[PDB]
Symmetry: C4
Subunit: 386 residues, 4 copies
């Protein structure tokens, strides 16, 4: 089957909890990878958690976090959703310190970037066979989504960035068919900054909501059709989505400069003029998580919103978050179902350990009754290795 | 295939041992979840053990019992019958501190309740995809069976409770089709109390035998057809089924008030006016287990019975128990086979440990020779974490 | 696919090594069951190692030997051939302190005996579903092969013993179809003793070579056709097959009384008037292993033989051994291939540990070049738990 | 599916990283085999890592390297590519201290050599069933490739050696069909030395590049067609391929005598008159790894070359390396894709441990952009067992 991707996002009123892996609690005794960015991606048959590991287990000396993030040991692996990421249940995908994956209905596409900062190379695999490579074109840390790419009608789409993370860089949309790049376009986006995009298919097109690490505390977006004809902007809501960020106030259709430097991987779902925003509860640290429905937040700059659903209390650590979808071929629904995952980061720099890892929770949007709560990581730090 | 569920319970004379997982003995060294309620549920192809875990392993500090039962860490998992429940052999099912699951012949239905005490939400999944939610309607600990639901002719049925565990609460029957609630009915049951129901199909209808936590030391039951027309009662036998309970004597068709408060999840199988009762051997603690055949015990209040089969000796810990069936589509028989599982609880509050866990045994009803014995947990407590 | 079982044993000249699991060496660190009798059985698709475990892991306190052999914790498990038997790679089969298993071409039959000594019950499963039970008929430790049963033309056959292990007992052949006992016969075998039979199919019939624990240091045998017409005798060769045994000398077609009490599970393959004998190298302890070809040893009493192939040196521990076959439906050959497994027992009573376990090696008969060697267990005892 | 093997090697410009297993880093805490020679072999559906283990885990006393290399404990296993080789994810293949494996499109062939030095026996398996044996014909350590065999048109091909490793030995090509040897030829190769061959299919023929342990610091080669008509030579490039070796200088069509004794398993790919050479960076120790393209290096003796791609830095340990291919039936390409693996050896003799093991990296040849880097093992030695 080919995922057609022609349906629209399902109407939803809230988010129902889908998974929680308790990876760090389990890794206190079991053999569990130290991981980051545990993104979920689904096929027409199953959902999988992808993640990056340094090839080290929790509570082992090799978890010592003084290793660089872009190291030669870092690999992309995947395990079933909701399971602790272990060498005994994880499939190897690619050598990678930056990554993406998605399924077009016939096979898994994985994208793994490795190599040195001045000449990194993305290796594209389709069903685990190398099908293409993309080399850094600006020689300054080629990097990609750290969540699932989006597939429409037999083609898959991703965003890659090359250049500074504290200034103007270069952004490319890629169209990939059976793992071969068939088209690429560099965005003409002066004064924009795109990193770590969350992209989802919707009505035959793709929407990506990303991270401005240069000078925006609201999130940039880019949407495009199957030929990579594109539009760009920033989410206008004064419910600002990045972290760090200022207190909610008047937004902008351009980058909001106050507290704009630095950031966090996040996501949002557009519903016409409205937007569902996932964000941390703290404005200054990666703490808490909440879903906010702003019925005019895509296009209007006020800070008013209609619904807030709690996900993680502000007293608990959160982390990266990303979108994923479940297509009709998987669900049997007539619409595209939006979902998201949250990474719950424990360890350095906020806690007195030698290591850093995340566990994950995930939710799916439903048009039935839901409830806010807090589903935090739950591990008791420090560990015995510390 | 659709499980028709139109056949009657097989004639049986005793219980043959089906599985034993040795989970706690193995968890002394291996990586084994701390678990509760390991109920079994079967498809037309296989049987699985479902269980709730806090995401903690035996002999690890996170197994510390001080965590509340309704925590955000609690998840429903499943593994093959008879295997130690490990993070390396277990499937994730749902985030849940109360749960149910069953198979209709075409897919697994799982029901997992999480969220706060005043607004819990049951997430319904079919083949692992969220298909519906049910929110608390009394705002007082929505909770369900902790054993398998019952499927007949393409619909699956379960019982949910909301309200006090020491007084009158509210009880609903649900009819579920492919994970969607298609009908629900509130029982009109003043002075009844229903919790932790064990439900099985029989001749196109469902029978549930439950736990009266309020004021009954015999077990209440409810049976209903596919339109949710229902009957309610209490098992009349003077062989009382709950724990705690009084000494055997004259029973009642209503709740037996002596020692009626508190209780334990249990089960029974009705055969016309007779009943097979599974119960602890002790009247005051969760110790021992036995199967009693009382040929007039469903409807008559005397305490005489015909057959007793030992399952666990009175000197050994037992725990929760539940029914499961094997349908003709799985066994090739022309009747519905009754089976049951027993949880063997070790640790708190009876033993000097920081943790509480169960292991499991299970038995199938057969019309051939059987024997009583004792198949206890067998772990040597305390563990080194203690 | 039904295994016809109508072919004869392949002509062979020696034994080629098939598998070695290194179970005890691996279990010094990994999570590995303490096991006994690791017998192999094959289907038309795969070969599996079955084994009995006490539900305890090597190097853990629950491996403490003081538990009796016939305990309620003992279970039959299986894993792929050549893998260390772990809770993470093993399938649960049955609760059992004595067992057998085989595949008829369409499904696995397992036989598991549990319960008390005076009333044990064999539980029969077909495809993991209970299909029959057999209760002790002499109330004195019902017991069976501890190796694979034999299947011919849709029926499987096994031997069960009930009664004394130091005197005359009672022996039954069972005919089983889809897990249901369809016929049984009690052997008329005064002065014979049958235990722990190794049975293989050959030309539409079954041949079993067993253990005389009463008063024979040669091995008894029983052969029968699909109607359970049977013949009985003892292997005549002065190359005595049991352990303990006298030095090789003049054999007997009846039980050889010298060193006759006690014994060890073993096997032999009949080729007309000749026999392949597997035995320990020591006459007094379970040390070493060798295959001997005696071209007239089935029917003649001399102690001369033609070929000896070393398997385990006399300076290394051996243990139980049993036959298995690979049918033409598995191999594509036009004959029945004979194979055997050997258990290498470490620990009590010969070594200063708290535990006893076995690892396994296996060999297949081939008509090409082979070599003798020693393939011992290789663990360094004692372990840290000792 | 029969792999035709009639295509030629794909044109390539560099090497893209395919896998990294981090086995030793993970095995610091996880249950991971001590391994050597982790060679990769692919079917039409998947790629697997084969390896030899002594049946011991990292960080356990049985990893003590005083056990000889040709021991009875040594076994050939396989696991998915990129996963740490563990007893929980590895399938058993054969008892072997020297081994080879490949897939003909319909099934796995494995060759495992065991037994004594003066009479070793290769056991050939097809789909895990013993199909043939080959006994030592010179009684002096029969040994084979330690990498994948080459399959063309329903036949698989391998090289075996018997005789001295410091003098003239005897070399045989084998043609194997469904695991049965159908033809063999002894090379007429006076003054040549062939060990540990890396063989690949190319245009209906097989090319093997090997290790001269006697007196060559360049590598010998043998190529042959499906009838085992063959040609022999040595790689002429003054870019010497063995380790140890002299500094780059004038090559030879025969064995280069300077530093010729001893060696390391390696590989090369012929492209007309040019050659891609994989070699260590150090001339004196097993350190570093690089790929060199020499456009006239197959047939000319100068030390000039065109392209160097770094794989492992000279300050990090490397080890054995070998070729593998991905056939068009797996990739969908119209050519034969060349790939290679590198073993990263840690421990004795270079480091102060009791053990020796390898982890692995692998690369595939592509005609797109690539980059040099260093992907070393990354474990911190010594371990706590030391
Ligand atoms: C078994 O179920 C069938 C299936 O029909 C159900 O009808 C829906 C209302 C809903 O309950 C779904 O689960 C099913 O699809 C029953 O057949 C139907 O019965 C109704 C009324 O009796 C009739 O109007 C329909 O036409 C029937 N449909 C079909 C396809 O036959 C059937 O009654 C059930 N059998 C028993 C013994 O209860
Ligand atoms: C590819 O193989 C076919 C088949 O050859 C047979 O099968 C092989 C597995 C092996 O057993 C060979 O020895 C067999 O001959 C070859 O086709 C055969 O060619 C011969 C003449 O050379 C002819 O007599 C047969 O009839 C052919 N058989 C079939 C089924 O076509 C073919 O030549 C091989 N191709 C190459 C390039 O060598
Ligand atoms: C082989 O089996 C055939 C099938 O019939 C059998 O019938 C009953 C009695 C059982 O024994 C059951 O296992 C089988 O289904 C026979 O017709 C045939 O005679 C048997 N013997 C042969 C072919 O030699
Ligand atoms: C998508 O396209 C298919 C035809 O290819 C059509 O049947 C279906 O209704 C379309 N869905 C939407 C939501 O447009
Ligand atoms: C962690 O790494 C740093 C840098 O290599 C090292 O200096 C430090 O001592 C390490 N700490 C531990 C606990 O391993
Ligand atoms: C989908 O792809 C197919 C072939 O790749 C093409 O016919 C069509 O233009 C695309 N668009 C839609 C809406 O199907
Ligand atoms: C159930 O339905 C099947 C098929 O209609 C029938 O063969 C079977 O006998 C029925 N059983 C009962 C008890 O109605
Ligand atoms: C268990 O939890 C209690 C709760 O405060 C804590 O005080 C105690 O130290 C814990 N014990 C262990 C062994 O972790
Ligand atoms: C066994 O039966 C099969 C089925 O027809 C036949 O092909 C084969 O030759 C028979 N073998 C013997 C030894 O009778
Ligand atoms: C083993 O079991 C016996 C049984 O009583 C016990 O007395 C002994 O202390 C145990 N030994 C160890 C080392 O656990
Ligand atoms: C290999 O043989 C097949 C036979 O059908 C042919 O189609 C294919 O093109 C051939 N390839 C080459 C490279 O000769
Ligand atoms: C390793 O093996 C040798 C061989 O007997 C032994 O002498 C030595 O003490 C062992 N060392 C360790 C650390 O186990
Ligand atoms: Ca920002
Ligand atoms: Ca607004
Ligand atoms: Ca009660
Ligand atoms: Ca009664
Ligand atoms: Ca461990
Ligand atoms: Ca004897
Ligand atoms: Ca003789
Ligand atoms: Ca050399
Ligand atoms: Ca040159």
């Amino acid at each position: 089957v080919i995922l057609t991707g022609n349906s629209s996002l399902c109407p939803i009123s809230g988010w129902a909890i889908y998974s929680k892996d308790n990876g760090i609690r389990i890794g206190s005794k079991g053999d569990v990878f130290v991981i980051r960015e545990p993104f979920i991606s689904c096929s027409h048959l199953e959902c999988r958690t992808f993640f990056l590991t340094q090839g080290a287990l929790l509570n082992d000396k090799h978890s010592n976090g003084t290793v660089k993030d872009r190291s030669p040991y870092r690999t992309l692996m995947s395990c079933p959703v909701g399971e602790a990421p272990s060498p005994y249940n994880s499939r190897f995908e690619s050598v990678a310190w930056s990554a993406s994956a998605c399924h077009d209905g016939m096979g898994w596409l994985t994208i793994g970037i490795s190599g040195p900062d001045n000449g990194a190379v993305a290796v594209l695999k389709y069903n685990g066979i190398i099908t293409d490579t993309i080399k850094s074109w600006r020689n300054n840390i080629l990097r990609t989504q750290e969540s699932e790419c989006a597939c429409v009608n037999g083609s898959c789409f991703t965003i890659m960035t090359d250049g500074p993370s504290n200034g103007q860089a270069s952004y490319k949309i890629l169209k990939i068919e059976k793992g071969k790049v068939t088209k690429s376009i560099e965005l003409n986006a002066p004064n924009y900054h795109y990193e770590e995009c969350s992209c989802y298919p919707d009505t035959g097109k793709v929407m990506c909501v990303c991270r401005d690490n240069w000078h925006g505390s609201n999130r940039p977006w880019v949407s495009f059709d199957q030929n990579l004809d594109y539009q760009i902007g920033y989410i206008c809501s004064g419910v600002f989505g990045d972290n760090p960020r200022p207190n909610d106030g008047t937004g902008s259709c351009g980058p909001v400069s106050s507290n704009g430097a630095n950031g966090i991987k996040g996501f949002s779902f557009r519903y016409d003029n409205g937007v569902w925003i996932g964000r941390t509860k703290s404005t200054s640290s990666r703490s808490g998580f909440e879903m906010i429905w702003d019925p005019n937040g895509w296009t209007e700059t006020d800070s008013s919103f209609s619904v807030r659903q709690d996900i993680v209390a502000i007293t608990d650590w959160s982390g990266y978050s990303g979108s994923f979808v479940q297509h009709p071929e998987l669900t049997g629904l007539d619409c595209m179902r939006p979902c998201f995952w949250v990474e719950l980061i424990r360890g350095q720099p906020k806690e007195n350990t030698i290591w850093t890892s995340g566990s994950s929770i995930s939710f799916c949007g439903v048009n039935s009754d839901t409830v806010g709560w807090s589903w935090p990581d739950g591990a008791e730090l420090p560990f015995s290795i510390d």
